[PDB]
Symmetry: D2
Subunit: 400 residues, 4 copies
C-alpha cells in the first residue's frame, strides 16, 4: 500500500467540494480530519517509529497530488512535512525518538509560528525569558502562523531580548498546542489559500519545558553560517512550495481540458465547428503542457538531489548544500511562472461562461498568486545568476 495511491483517493473526494469550500473560506476541519484518518501525517517518519519511511521524491508526488485537488491542503500538508525534520535537523537523539513516535501513533498535525509583521522579515519581536530550570516563557504575537490552528504540535520560534548578551538568540521549540496562553486566532484571510490557517497566534506567558526546547539557543543561525544539516531547512521548504504550484497548475490544466472537451463552444465567426479542433486552442494547450513538462522535469531531478544530500546527513558540505539550493531556487522560479501563466491563461480556452462561480476556475490562480509572494521570486532568480556567473552560493537562511 503506497501513499500516492492513498493521496489519489483523497483527491477524488475533495474535488467535489473544492468550489464550495474555496468560496466559503475559513478552516477546513473535515478535510484535515480525512487526512489524519489516511495516516499520511507520518509520511516522512521512519518505519521504526511507526511511520511510512518514504523518501523525499515519493513524498513529493503525494504533495503534488493533494495540491492538484486543493492548493490550500497541498500547502497545509506541505508545511506539515517541513516541520518534523527540524527535530532531527537540530534536536537531540532523545527528542528524535520521543517526538517522531508521538506524532506517528497519535497522528498529530503540526504547525509553526515563526514569521511576524513589524519592520522587516529579519525582525522577530517575541520575547523568551530564560527560567532558572532551563525553560523559556514566550511573550508576544505572530502573524503568518502556517497551519497553527487546529494542530496538535506547534513548532514555535522566539528571541531573547534584554541587557544580557543574548541579543538575536533565536530559540526553537516544539510544544503542544494546548499549552496555557497560546491562542491561534481565526483572523486568517487572503485572496487565495483561504483554508491554510496562516493567521496570528498570541502568546500570553506560554511556558516551554527543557525537553521541548529544540537545540541550543541560536542553534539555527549557527547551522546556517556553518552550512550544516540544519541549513537544509530552506532547500526542503522551497522544493515543496514549488511542487505545490506545479500541482495547482496540473489541476488547472486538467480542469480546463475537460471543460474544453464538454462545455466550450467553437468561435463560429472564424468558421470553426469544433472547440477541440481550434488551432489556437490546440496551440495554447501545447504551450501549457510544455511549460509544465520542463518545470516538472527540473522538479523531479531536484528531488533526487535533495534525497542524495539528505542521506549524507552531517557529512554534507557547503558545496552540496549550495548547489542544491541553486537548483531548488531554479525550480521555484519555473514553478511560479508556469503556475501563474497556466492558471491565468487557462481562461483563454475556457471562455466567458467559465467565469461563473460554480466552476471556481479562478481558485487555481488565486492560490498560486497568494503563496508565490511568500518569498520574492526575483531573488530566487538572482541567487541562480550569482552562481551561474560567479559561483557564489546563496547565504543560508530561512528561505535562501
Amino acid at each position: 500500500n503506497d501513499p500516492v495511491a492513498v493521496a489519489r483517493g483523497l483527491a477524488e473526494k475533495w474535488r467535489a467540494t473544492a468550489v464550495e469550500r474555496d468560496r466559503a473560506g475559513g478552516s477546513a476541519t473535515a478535510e484535515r480530519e480525512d487526512l489524519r484518518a489516511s495516516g499520511l501525517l507520518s509520511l516522512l517518519v521512519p518505519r521504526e517509529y511507526g511511520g511510512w519511511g518514504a523518501d523525499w521524491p515519493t513524498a513529493i508526488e503525494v504533495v503534488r497530488e493533494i495540491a492538484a485537488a486543493d492548493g490550500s491542503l497541498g500547502h497545509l500538508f506541505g508545511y506539515h512535512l517541513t516541520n518534523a525534520p527540524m527535530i532531527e535537523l537540530i534536536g537531540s537523539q532523545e527528542q528524535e525518538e520521543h517526538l517522531y513516535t508521538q506524532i506517528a501513533q497519535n497522528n498529530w498535525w503540526t504547525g509553526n509560528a515563526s514569521s511576524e509583521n513589524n519592520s522587516h522579515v529579519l525582525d522577530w519581536k517575541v520575547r523568551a525569558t530564560p527560567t532558572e530550570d532551563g525553560g523559556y516563557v514566550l511573550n508576544g504575537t505572530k502573524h503568518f502562523c502556517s497551519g497553527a490552528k487546529g494542530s496538535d504540535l506547534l513548532f514555535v520560534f522566539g528571541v531573547v531580548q534584554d541587557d544580557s548578551p543574548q541579543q538575536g538568540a533565536i530559540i526553537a521549540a516544539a510544544i503542544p498546542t494546548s499549552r496555557a496562553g497560546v491562542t491561534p486566532n481565526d483572523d486568517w484571510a487572503a485572496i487565495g489559500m483561504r483554508q491554510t490557517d496562516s493567521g496570528s497566534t498570541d502568546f500570553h506567558n506560554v511556558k516551554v519545558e527543557p525537553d521541548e526546547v529544540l537545540g541550543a539557543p541560536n542553534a539555527f543561525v549557527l547551522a546556517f553560517i556553518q552550512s550544516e544539516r540544519g541549513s537544509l531547512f530552506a532547500p526542503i521548504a522551497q522544493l515543496i512550495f514549488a511542487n505545490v504550484y506545479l500541482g495547482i497548475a496540473h489541476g488547472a490544466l486538467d480542469a480546463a481540458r475537460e471543460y474544453t472537451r464538454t462545455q466550450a463552444r467553437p468561435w463560429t465567426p472564424a468558421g470553426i465547428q469544433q472547440a477541440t479542433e481550434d488551432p489556437y486552442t490546440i496551440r495554447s494547450y501545447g504551450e501549457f503542457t510544455i511549460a509544465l513538462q520542463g518545470a516538472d522535469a527540473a522538479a523531479r531531478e531536484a528531488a533526487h538531489l535533495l534525497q542524495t544530500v539528505w542521506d549524507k546527513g552531517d557529512a554534507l558540505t557547503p558545496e552540496d548544500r549550495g548547489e542544491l539550493m541553486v537548483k531548488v531556487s531554479g525550480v521555484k522560479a519555473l514553478a511560479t511562472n508556469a503556475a501563474l501563466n497556466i492558471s491565468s491563461g487557462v481562461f483563454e480556452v475556457i471562455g466567458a461562461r467559465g467565469t461563473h462561480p460554480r466552476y471556481g476556475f479562478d481558485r487555481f490562480w488565486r492560490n498560486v498568486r497568494t503563496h508565490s509572494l511568500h518569498d520574492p521570486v526575483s531573488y530566487k532568480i538572482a541567487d541562480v545568476g550569482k552562481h551561474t556567473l560567479n559561483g557564489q552560493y546563496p547565504i543560508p537562511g530561512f528561505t535562501s
Copy 2:
C-alpha cells in the same frame, strides 16, 4: 467649455473609499449609477443641439478610461452605455435621432441593451419578433446575457423574425422604454469579475415595439455589415471601448500598486536591502508595467482619432476606411488585453504577501480584466491583423469584428 474628464476624476476619488467593499459585495451598484446620472456624463456623446455634451470619441474615451481605473464594472457599464445611442445614427432615421437623443439628454437616461448573440446562429437567438400590420413587432423570449438592462431607462433590443415570411431570419433593432410591459431585467448576473456590470438576463413577454421605435428596415444591421456602411462601425466602437476599459483597470492596478509600495511594502532584508522603493528588481517591474502600458495607450489614442476620422466621414465612409479601422482596433484590443492581464497579475510581485488581504482587494483588477477579456477570443483579433498584414484581407464585418 465644461471639463468632462475633471468630473470623472471627482467621482473616482469618491468611489475609491468604497471600491473594495462594492467588489466583494457584488450585485448592482445603484448608488454609483446615480452619481453618474447626477454628474450629467450620461449625455457625453449626445450632440449639443439636443442638450448633450457634444464631445468627440477621444475625449469620450478619456472619461471612460478614468472611470474604469477606479472601478472595472462601472467603467464597462458606462462604456457600454455610450455605444447604445450612436446605433440610432448608424441605422435609425433623422426623426428618431432628434427625438431619442433629446429624451436621453434632457431626462438623463441610462441605456442598456439586449442586442446581439454574437456566437449564436440568428435562428437560435432567444428573442423572437412577430410582426404586426401597423409596422411594429411583438417580442417574446429570454436573452441569456444583456448589458446594463437592469436599471436602464431606454433599452436597445434585437429580435429575430422566426416565422414564415420574407422577413424570416431578419434582425430587428428597437429602442424601447425599459418599463415597457413585458420587459423584466433579472438580477441574475454572477462572475468572478465585472460583478456590478448588471450583465444578467432580461425576459420579454409580449413586449410591443411601436413603428417609430423600430431602427431602420428589417435586417438593417446585417445589410450594413455586408456593405461596410455606417452600421458596420458597431464592432469598431464596442471593441475600442473594451480595450480602453482594460487599459483603465491596469492604470488603477498600477496606481494602487505604486501607493502600496511607497507606504506599506517592506524591503527584502536578506538581500541587504534598506528600502522597498530602492529595490532594483521592483524598480524594473514598474518600468516594464509602465512601458507595456505606454505602448498600448499610445496605440489606443491613435485608434480613437482614426475612429473619429471615419465617424466624421458619415455615410460616405468606404469599406477601406472601416476595414483599416477595425484592423487598428483589433490590434489595440490585443495590446490592451495582454498588458492588462500582465500588469493586474504582475503587480502582486511588488506588493508582497500582506497585500493578498481582502481589505486591500488588489485582485479585483485582474478578476475584472480576466472576466471581460473572454467576451470575444483575443486569438482571432490577433489573427485578423495577421490576415491583413500578410494577405491584405479585411475582417468580415459583424458584431465582434
Copy 3:
C-alpha cells in the same frame, strides 16, 4: 573507453579555431577526420558488430559536448548517428550484420539523401526504376543532403513513379557514396550551420543492388501507418536536434560568462562598480540558466523514455511510440525557444565591443536560427496540444 571524455578532448582542440571555421564556411574536413580517428563514428553500433554499443543517453551527451563547441559538428555527427539505426529499423538481419560491421571496422562516415519532408510522394526528385534482378536505378537531384559530401555509406530514398503496380512506393537504400552516378555537390550555404555539408546531391542512373535495399518497397511508409519499430526515426532524429540546440545554448552561455567576468565594463552612470555585481546582468544570467535547467531536465527524461521504447523491440505498441513522440515534440520546442532566447539575449550582458567578429559571438544564434527551421516548431507544439486535449497521437512520418 569514455566517449564523453573523448568528445571533451575534441572540443578542447577545436575551440582554438571555432571562430575561424564559422567565418570560412565550407567543409570542416580536418575536424571531420578528428571525429573518425577518435572512433566516435561507430558509437551507436553494438559491440558484437565492432562498435561502442553505446545507449541513447550516452550518445546524446556526446552530441551535446560536440554541439557546444561547434554547432555544425554537432548536427553533422548527430545526423550521422540516426542513419545507421535505419538498417535495424526496417532492414533485415543479414544486412544488419553486413552493413554494421562494414561501418564499424572501416570507421565510416554516413550521409543522407533520404526523405523530402515537405513533398508529396509523387513529387520527389530522386526516382527509382525497378530492375529485373530485384534492384533499383536512381535518377534525380535531392537538394538537402546532410553529410553526403565526404561520406562512405549514403542513405538514399527513391520513389517509383510509373505505370507499375508498385506506383509511388518509397525505396530506402544504403549504397556506397562512390557508386557510379553519385555526385554530392559542394553548393551548401547559409547564415549558420555553415559546415554541415547539407548541399544537393545528384543521382544519374545509380545502381542499387538487391541486397542494398532496406526492407520491402514502401517499408517506411507501412511502418509509419502501423507505428512499427520503423516509426522510431522521427523521435530519434528530433531528440538529437533538440540536444544540438541545447548544446549550442550552453556554448553561448559559457562564452558569455567568460566575457562578463573578464572583459565587460560596469555601467557607472548608474553607480555600478563591477559588471559582475550588476543586478540586471545577474538577473539575465539567472533566467538563461533557469531556461536551460527546465529544457535539459526534460530532454534527459525523454532519452530514458527513448531507451525504454528502443529496448522493447518489435513489442513496442502505437501507444509507446505516440507517448514518446509527444514528449520529444515538447523537448524540441523547449530546446528551440531556450537556445534562441539565450544565444540572442547573451549579447545584452556582453556589450557593444563583443560584437567584433574575432569573438564570433553571433555564431551560436546563427546556427540554431538556421536548423530550428528544419521542421516547424509551431507543429511540434500543436502535436503536444492535440495529445493533451484530445488524446490524439502524432501522425507518423519523418518529422513526427
Copy 4:
C-alpha cells in the same frame, strides 16, 4: 528644400534596397550611398531655412530616419547620428557658432561625425587629454573608439578632457573641427556582426589644435547644462529617440522582407494538410503578433516625437520637469523599439523557413544590425529609469544617454 523630405528619402531607400544584400556581406564604408545622401540635400534637414536648410520639424526628420533605416540599418544610423551631431552647436554654442556652422553645413552639404566614446575601464572614464592654449583653444591627444561617421565626414564633433593647473582641471570640452585638421586620423578599422557600414572605428588625435571659436560653450558646458537640465541636456532625448526609430525602421524592413518571401517562396507544411503558406494559421498568428508589437511601439515613438518638438520649441524656457518627463517617455520608447525589433528580426525566420537561410537573401542582416546597436547603451537602465519615475517621481540623471 521645398519638397517633402520623406518622399525624397523613400527614393533613396528604393535605390539602396537593390544593393542592400551585397553591401551588408561586403561591409566597409558606404561611400556611394553617403554621396547619394549628400547630393539629395537632406544633410541640412534640421538646419533652419535662414542658414540655407530645410527647417523640418522633429517628427518629419524622424520619419526620414525610419525610412532610410528600413532599407539599410547602417545608413539610418549614420544619418540619424548626423542629425544629433548638428544640434550640439545651438544646444551649447553661441549665436555666432550657430549662424556660421549651420550655414556652412547647408551650403556645403557637410557630412558630420563624432569622436566621443573611448575604450577605457568604463564609459565615464575618458583619457583623451586637452591641453589649453593662451588663445583660448586646446590641443588634443589620445584615441577615440566608436567614431560613427568620423571617416569621410567634413566636420568632426570631438569631446576632450582638460589637463591644466586651474579650476578647468577635469572639465569636458565640446568642439566642432574640420575632419582634415592636422593630427586627426580617422581609422578604417570598424568591424562588427552588424551595423557594418557605420564607420564606427577608432580616431587618433596627435597634437590636434582646437581653435577658440571652434570650442562649443564654456569649459564643462555640457556637464553644467546636464545638471541644470537646461537646453543642452536635450542631447540624450534626441539621440535616444532617433536610435529607437532606427530599430523600428529595421523591424519594418525585416517584416516587409519576410512578408514578401512568405508570399512568393515559402511552402506550406503539407504534413499538417496546409494548402498554401499564406493560409497557415500559425504563420497568420506570427505576422499578427509582429504587427501588433510594432503598432504599439510606433505609436509610442510618434507620441514622444511630438513631445520632443513641444519641449524643443520652448527653447530656454524648458524646465527640469519638461526635460525629465520627455526623457522618461523616450527611455520607454527605446525599450519598446529594442525588444520589438529583436523579437521580429529573429522571429521572422519561423515564417520564412529553411531555404531563406541562404546568404543571397541576407535575411539575418536585420537582426545583426539591431542586435549590434541595441548594445549602444543598456536597455535595462532605460527600463529602470522609467521605474524610478513611476514609483518615486524621480527623473533620470541627465547625461549623454539619459
